[PDB]
Design a protein around this ligand. Sequence first.
Ligand SMILES: O=C(O)/C=C/C(=O)O
Ligand SMILES: O=C(O)/C=C/C(=O)O
Ligand SMILES: [Ca+2]
Ligand SMILES: [Ca+2]
Ligand code: NI
Ligand code: NI
Ligand code: NI
Ligand code: NI
Ligand code: NI
Lengths: 418, 416
Amino acid sequence: GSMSFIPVAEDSDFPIQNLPYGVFSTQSNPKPRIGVAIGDQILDLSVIKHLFTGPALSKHQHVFDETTLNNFMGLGQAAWKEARASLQNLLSASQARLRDDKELRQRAFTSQASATMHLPATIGDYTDFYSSRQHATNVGIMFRGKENALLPNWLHLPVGYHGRASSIVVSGTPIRRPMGQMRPDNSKPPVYGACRLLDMELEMAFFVGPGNRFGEPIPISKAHEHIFGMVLMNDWSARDIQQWEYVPLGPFLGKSFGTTISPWVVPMDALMPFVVPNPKQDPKPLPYLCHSQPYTFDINLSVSLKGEGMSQAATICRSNFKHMYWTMLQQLTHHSVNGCNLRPGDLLASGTISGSDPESFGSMLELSWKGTKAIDVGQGQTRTFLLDGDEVIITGHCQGDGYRVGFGQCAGKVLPAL
Amino acid sequence: MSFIPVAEDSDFPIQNLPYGVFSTQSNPKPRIGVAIGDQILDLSVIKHLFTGPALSKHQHVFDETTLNNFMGLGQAAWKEARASLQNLLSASQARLRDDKELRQRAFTSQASATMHLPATIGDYTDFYSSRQHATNVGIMFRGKENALLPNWLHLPVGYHGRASSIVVSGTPIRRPMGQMRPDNSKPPVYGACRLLDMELEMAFFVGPGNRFGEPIPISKAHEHIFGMVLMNDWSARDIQQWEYVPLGPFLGKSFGTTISPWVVPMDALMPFVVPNPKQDPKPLPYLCHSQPYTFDINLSVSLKGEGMSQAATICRSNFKHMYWTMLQQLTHHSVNGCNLRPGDLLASGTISGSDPESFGSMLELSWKGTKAIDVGQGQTRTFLLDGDEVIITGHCQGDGYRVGFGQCAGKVLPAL
Ligand SMILES: O=C(O)/C=C/C(=O)O
Ligand SMILES: O=C(O)/C=C/C(=O)O
Ligand SMILES: [Ca+2]
Ligand SMILES: [Ca+2]
Ligand code: NI
Ligand code: NI
Ligand code: NI
Ligand code: NI
Ligand code: NI
């Protein structure tokens, strides 16, 4: 461990080893600005921007005056590492520069309790993958039968689809049950009405840094230079609407009514101590997707559900990000192999995260096994799918020697349809 | 008529007046202009002339580098801007015609301007609304009996596209690399795309948009459609075939999608509206509208390869061959509460008529590579070859004038 002059609870998501980036505003000042979480405080980077005197940031101090992290993400590794080094030094209990500047400290720090979080960046494009082998197998079994669970292409390329960028909202934003077209009865015409199979999907997502030129692929050996950091995500899904609409062009309205992400972007540098070797892949991937660099992470994920009448939330899923079959490097490389241009601020999601144990399935579709099994939510209540008033809260932590790297929370409450 | 001379066969008479973003060598800063004859009227130069109630307090939208803010203003602003423009350009109006100095600063030649994307496209969606196109593709992949899947006639099927790779006319498109499975009994291979194709489409830009969680009722859909552009949704058929089940088109589409630069406003297209096609079964009430919103727009596609002196017209179709209207597409897209934003682009889907000469893709024109397309000069094509340039154009024929779209062009570059 190491320590900041700012007191940090040992169980805190935000010790000096984390230092995630976010966009916030306060009651006293409505302008969205860039900040870093430390303990129960937020360090305002627009206030201390002039302290970044290193080579990479000196000429670009204005990136900290922005209302989004896009420009900072676009700067690349050198700038990221320099910013992190400066912050760790500045927040160190041994450093006097900020610690002893009573006047500056007053203007630079704000309690997280007084802040309103905003989306961390302007997301140009959002892509959602389907990289959890257990998730894909479970869904495949439920809709195609065990014999035809995984389609022939799954084990050869990280399958994915373009999502809707506009409806990605920050943690805390209410999600309204969607209206749409469904076809419950195969022998009858479709009907218009409120979604009956509302579900959540536990995922993680990463932001793209520099990006590539239109027409130029990103070699897998260079992929790691384009990944800025991660956030938690809940890909809200209307299963019945999707089932009717999705053949043969894919998920559309069943996903676009809302997708929530946590507000604190945890930088890859903060996650490196928790890297583990990649899962063995068989069949072996084509050369362009082959890389030895370990890039699988040990991140404990928890999903809790709190009904409108419940006093305490119930943990309904405990999973881990290390259960993904395709790594982020393979996802980013595959995404640009045709020359598609990834841009700073773009968001690439992992896909629903499911482990082998039934308690680690990342969606209520899997947890209730297509509504055949009731999920015990405690105090005599059960669930198959989400009910109005239900609140889903996703959290994640990496456990190190004497500290934890957390993501804050990814929450949302379901509102009744119109 | 305008005091600005306009050739009789010009795409840009005073009845059109499309919006675009351009720049010049003198001034590299992208700015908003309107096409008239072979000139461009710089709106940032004449922004002070918009004195009406809807624009007087929003003249700054004309100083922007994109049309987004203007699109977001809504129909009252769009209509006021058009009325002012038609008044200022009419040969009988003195204001702009006689202010020589302003006149010299406001106009520039199209032949010396560089066009840019008209807006920052937040999200792009592509539909599958041409019945003949869907049937043709279905017949090739699933066979005659299962050409059209069950949901097709019930809702305007579509998918989210890739926004970053939408490029303006003239941008070269590099043949994409990727995974393909030519032999179903062997593992997939990595290599250059072999079935590169184009897709004739049209697309419209969204205006004001809706709040997150609030659907746009069909009766108000017409209020959110700003204008249209031509589009070529470049496609890598072999890459798509292997990747698309069950989540849809991905890398087979995202390597590039071209749009023309001039946004023709809906008001210029109204004189060419025709009754909507009969839908059977009739759609659910939320998708029903009586207002005609199908348009008579002649589309033409030419191809010119290396070693060819003249380009050959390989397709002649029309936008009226669409089953689902733009009003139905917009309404369906927001029915679940999804928030459409100014500048969003919604494409029609490949346009195919019943006539074989009107099929909007080479996949259809060559019938999956079984029929050779004669492009003249002893040359034939099934799919695109390196060096091939595809040019799409579209026109509405009025009495004594034409409303044109300029062109949607692109040349194929060899794979890296
Ligand atoms: O309908 C399909 O299966 C495919 C259509 C397409 O590739 O355009
Ligand atoms: O694999 C499928 O067919 C569907 C997957 C999903 O809806 O998540
Ligand atoms: Ca998902
Ligand atoms: Ca298309
Ligand atoms: Ni230590
Ligand atoms: Ni925590
Ligand atoms: Ni195989
Ligand atoms: Ni490196
Ligand atoms: Ni013309």
